[PDB]
Amino acid sequence: DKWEMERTDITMKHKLGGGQYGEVYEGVWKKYSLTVAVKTLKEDTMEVEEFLKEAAVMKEIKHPNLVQLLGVCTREPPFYIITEFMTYGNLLDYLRECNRQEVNAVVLLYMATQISSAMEYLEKKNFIHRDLAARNCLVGENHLVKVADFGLSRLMTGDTYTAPAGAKFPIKWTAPESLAYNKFSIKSDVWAFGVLLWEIATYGMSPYPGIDLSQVYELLEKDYRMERPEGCPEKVYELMRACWQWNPSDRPSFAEIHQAFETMFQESSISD
Ligand SMILES: Cn1c(=O)c(-c2c(Cl)cccc2Cl)cc2cnc(Nc3cccc(CO)c3)nc21
């Protein structure tokens, strides 16, 4: 296993995420004097075999906008998943604390384009992300954004899977078919992407402000959708609305979404 490395090849420096991502640390890959991120399996939380499968999936991921795997420690506990380290943390906190004069309109477009590229890649590689949201996107220097990939599941593109009963998902980012029947497909990620676009346009505001979680589904079925955020370009809002079509088959593919954003980003750049 060319990915396998000895636990002693890495040294832990600081704990990360405040615990919101589980047991994650900022470490050092000694040989290369390289700062890395290290995820360890939190006993009594996720099942070991599922943890190891995520590691297996990451070995197959190679895209500029998906967190890159660097190595794994799977022989014996503690199990480790080592990846590149993103300097600025998650996109949600980044947007909430940034200088909006720097992180302006073209930058928001740039970030959406990068995320859509990552999702287009997953769509082509038979993967879905179980929780696409700003909280799971990481930021690096120069507004580089990479989608975290620990939450990836193997699912043939176009197919649907049914989650266990009692499964708890982020209601405000969850597609209708998931809320009602626990059904998920790549189109469910498209719906989530629309909510993510809203998070970006509002610089990290919470979705459906003030709306009780228990009534989100009842509102969605009657065609209620979040309003266009102040400052949000019409074309981008139109894409959000397309992502939120009730019928999953009516939602655009990430290939189409990425093309749309790439075009807007180019035209916007040509207006330098
Ligand atoms: C929190 N987190 C992860 O869970 C993974 C990761 C791992 Cl270790 C294994 C598998 C999949 C992933 Cl996405 C990679 C990763 C890379 N960079 C960062 N940077 C980061 C996070 C929080 C705060 C700050 C700033 O102090 C900087 N945080 C990261």
Residue numbers in the entry: 252 to 523
Question: Any passages from the paper?
Answer:
BCR–Abl is a constitutively activated form of the nonreceptor tyrosine kinase c-Abl. The improper activation of the Abl tyrosine kinase results in chronic myeloid leukemia (CML). The recognition of an inactive conformation of Abl, in which a catalytically important Asp-Phe-Gly (DFG) motif is flipped by approximately 180° with respect to the active conformation, underlies the specificity of the cancer drug imatinib, which is used to treat CML. Our results suggest that interconversion between distinctly different inactive conformations is a characteristic feature of the Abl kinase domain.
Molecules E and G were obtained from the same crystal form of Abl and are very similar, except for the presence of either the ATP-peptide analog (molecule E) or the kinase inhibitor PD166326 (molecule G). In these structures, the kinase adopts a conformation intermediate between αC-Glu In and αC-Glu Out: while helix αC is not rotated out of the active site of the kinase, a rotation of the side chain of Glu 286 has occurred, resulting in the breakage of the Glu 286–Lys 271 salt bridge. The conformation of Abl represented by molecules E and G suggests a mechanism by which Abl can interconvert between αC-Glu In and αC-Glu Out conformations.
